[PDB]
Amino acid sequence: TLNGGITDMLTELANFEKNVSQAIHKYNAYRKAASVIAKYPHKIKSGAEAKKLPGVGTKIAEKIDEFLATGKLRKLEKIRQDDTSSSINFLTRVSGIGPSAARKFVDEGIKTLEDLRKNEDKLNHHQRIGLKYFGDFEKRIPREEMLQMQDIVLNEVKKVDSEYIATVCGSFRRGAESSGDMDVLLTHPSFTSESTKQPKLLHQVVEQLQKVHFITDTLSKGETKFMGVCQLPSKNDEKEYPHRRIDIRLIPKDQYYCGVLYFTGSDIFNKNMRAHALEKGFTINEYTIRPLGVTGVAGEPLPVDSEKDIFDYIQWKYREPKDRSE
DNA sequence: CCGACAGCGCATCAGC
DNA sequence: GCTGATGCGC
DNA sequence: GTCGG
Ligand SMILES: Cc1cn([C@H]2C[C@H](O)[C@@H](COP(=O)(O)C(F)(F)P(=O)(O)C(F)(F)P(=O)(O)O)O2)c(=O)[nH]c1=O
Ligand SMILES: [Cl-]
Ligand SMILES: [Cl-]
Ligand SMILES: [Cl-]
Ligand SMILES: [Mg+2]
Ligand SMILES: [Mg+2]
Ligand code: NA
Ligand code: NA
């Protein structure tokens, strides 16, 4: 919050380059800067001072000047004023609709929530459900509720097979007081890097979670990744709880640490860590951390028996989950 | 300057 | 059907 | 849009 104005401006800038300009790198550039300025322990006094931070170059510097001065950014004003742009920014806020679909729709004349509705016949399933809970999905999830959703989940998993270990990651594992959604990492001893002794392992948990009306809809579902909606039940007369997005990732029980590190993020932290890994001569994904021999190709899995071991490989002092919020 | 910029699962399409 | 690209998402 | 070689 210390530099909220600047970061927000950088965030609006990043959402625009991504949603309208479809310039994925400019989107990321603005995000890094926003992230770097976010954790800066001083109330930035100038664009020249912000530049003293990696990720902030001349361009953002100028804009920070234009912002600190007037109290806003002209480039943005003209963007908030355009219609197609603001309209494309809005449709992307629907789950399943990215910059492409957005622009298309907006070309076809569809440009508002009302338009999306009278045109439901024009959305695939995912976009369909995305519109169904457009509102609900915009709301935060109080941690106290994350705690209740967890119990339903850990307890419905333990009911299918006591050998399943379900871990809530994302912002929750990072100690956040509120979360955007529930991210559940799942592991069963019947599925390792060596073999899938049991199929439907993920389908089993999804079914059981649907059997008890926790999972309400599916956005997409694979052999190892489920994407959907769930709802904490309410007590008598109680108004219903918002509908929430839930993702369940099944990872080989022997690659759990690379998986938990992955699913705890943050996304930018995962980006900076995975980016540093390269500079150090490693490549990190959600399964393992391998080397990058001469040719440049990835070697074989390096032994990992704890999250920290991964931080070690790349010469990085360990960082608590609560400190990976970038 | 200039090329890298993290890494991958599911849906869906093109082309075969 | 298959694979590779592309969209969208985590 | 920024940065490292
Ligand atoms: C986006 C994304 C996710 N993840 C991994 C690392 C991420 O930590 C993890 C969760 O992904 P989400 O549920 O998409 C998330 F980002 F929203 P969150 O971190 O849970 C969150 F706190 F922002 P909230 O949802 O609002 O509570 O997946 C990545 O590695 N890269 C990505 O681009
Ligand atoms: Cl770009
Ligand atoms: Cl691992
Ligand atoms: Cl791998
Ligand atoms: Mg999440
Ligand atoms: Mg999620
Ligand atoms: Na800088
Ligand atoms: Na979207």
CATH of the domain at A195: 3.30.460.10
User: Which tokens sit at A271?
Assistant: 């980006």
A206 shares a domain with A280: no
Crossing angle (nearest 10°) for helices A58-70 and A74-81? 80
Tokens 């071991």 -> residue: A309
Contacts of A165 (CB under 8 A, 6+ apart): A186, A187, A188, A253
Q: What are phi and psi of A305, to 5 degrees?
A: -125, 20
Cα A225 from Cα A223, distance rounded (Å): 6
Task: Establish whether the linkage from the previous residue to A266 is cis, with ω within 30° of 0.
Answer: yes
Residue nearest to nucleotide B12 (CA to C1'): A124
Task: Give the Cα separation of A58 and A84 in Å (integer).
Answer: 29
CA of A96 to the centre of ligand 2 (A): 22
What residues does the ion ligand 6 have nearby, CB within 5 Å?
Answer: A 181, 183, 247
Tell which of A241, A262, A283 closes a domain: A262
Length of chain A: 326
Whether residue A172 is found in the same domain as residue A73: no
Q: What is the resolution of this structure in A?
A: 2.5
Does A104 share its domain with A193? no
For the record, the structure tokens of A49 come out as 């001072």
**A53 and A106 both lie in a single domain:** no
Nearest nt to A282, CA vs C1'? B6
Contact between residue A178 and residue A129 where contact means Cβ atoms under 8 Å apart: no
Q: Which domain holds residue A304?
A: 263-325
Distance from C-alpha of A260 to C-alpha of A258, rounded to nearest angstrom: 6
| Burial readout A114-134 (b: 16 or more C-beta within 10 A, e: otherwise) | eebeeeeeebeebbbbbbbbe
* Residues A255 and A152 reside in one and the same domain: yes
Residue closest to A186 by CA, chosen among A141, A229, A222, A147: A222
**β-strands A178-179, A165-168 pairing:** unpaired
Rounded-to-integer distance, Cα A203 and Cα A139, Å: 28
Interhelix angle for A83-92 vs A74-81, to 10°?
80
| Cβ neighbours for A203, distance < 8 A, ≥ 6 positions apart | A221, A223
Residue A106 sits in the same domain as residue A6: no
* Site of tokens 């169904």: A132
**Which nt has its C1' nearest the CA of A105?**
C7
Residue in A208, A206, A215, A207 with CA at minimum distance from that of residue A233: A215
> A200 — phi, psi (to 5°)?
60, 5
- Amino acid sitting at position A248: I
Domain match, A280 and A172 both: no
Are A186 and A228 members of one domain? Answer: yes
Question: Any atom of strand B under 7 A from CB of A280?
Answer: no
From ligand 5's centre to the CA of A245, what distance in Å?
Answer: 9
Dihedral of the CA atoms A273, A277, A282, A286 (nearest 10)? 0
Six-digit token string for A13: 């800038």
CATH number of the domain that residue A319 is part of: 3.30.210.10
State which of A111, A139, A167 marks the end of a domain.
Answer: A139
Q: Let me know whether A18 and A103 are in one domain.
A: no
**A93 & A172 share domain:** no
Closest CA to A16 of A119, A113, A71, A88: A88
Residue A251 CB closer than 7 angstroms to strand B?
no
- Residue A32's CB is within 10 A of a number of other CB atoms, namely 21
Q: Give the angle A190-A193-A194 at the CA atoms, nearest 5°.
A: 75
Number of domains in chain A: 4
Nucleotide C2 C1' to residue A61 CA (A): 51
Instruction: Return the axis-axis angle of helices A24-38 and A4-19, rounded to nearest 10°.
Output: 170
Question: A53 among the known binding-site residues?
Answer: yes
The answer on A170 and A107 residing in a single domain is: no
Backbone angles phi, psi at A119, to 5 degrees: -125, 20
> Which of A238, A262, A286 is at the close of a domain?
A262
A222 Cβ nearer than 7 Å to chain B strand: yes
Q: Is residue A183 within 8 Å of residue A260, measured between CB atoms? A: no
User: Which amino acids bring their CB within 6 angstroms of ligand 1?
Assistant: A 170-171, 179-181, 183, 247, 262-267, 270
- Method of elucidation: X-ray
* A232 in the same domain as A150: yes
Which CATH number goes with the domain that contains A105? 1.10.150.20
For strand B, is any atom closer than 7 Å to the CB of A189?
Answer: no
**Comparing C-alpha atoms, which of A127, A58, A128 is closest to residue A97?**
A127
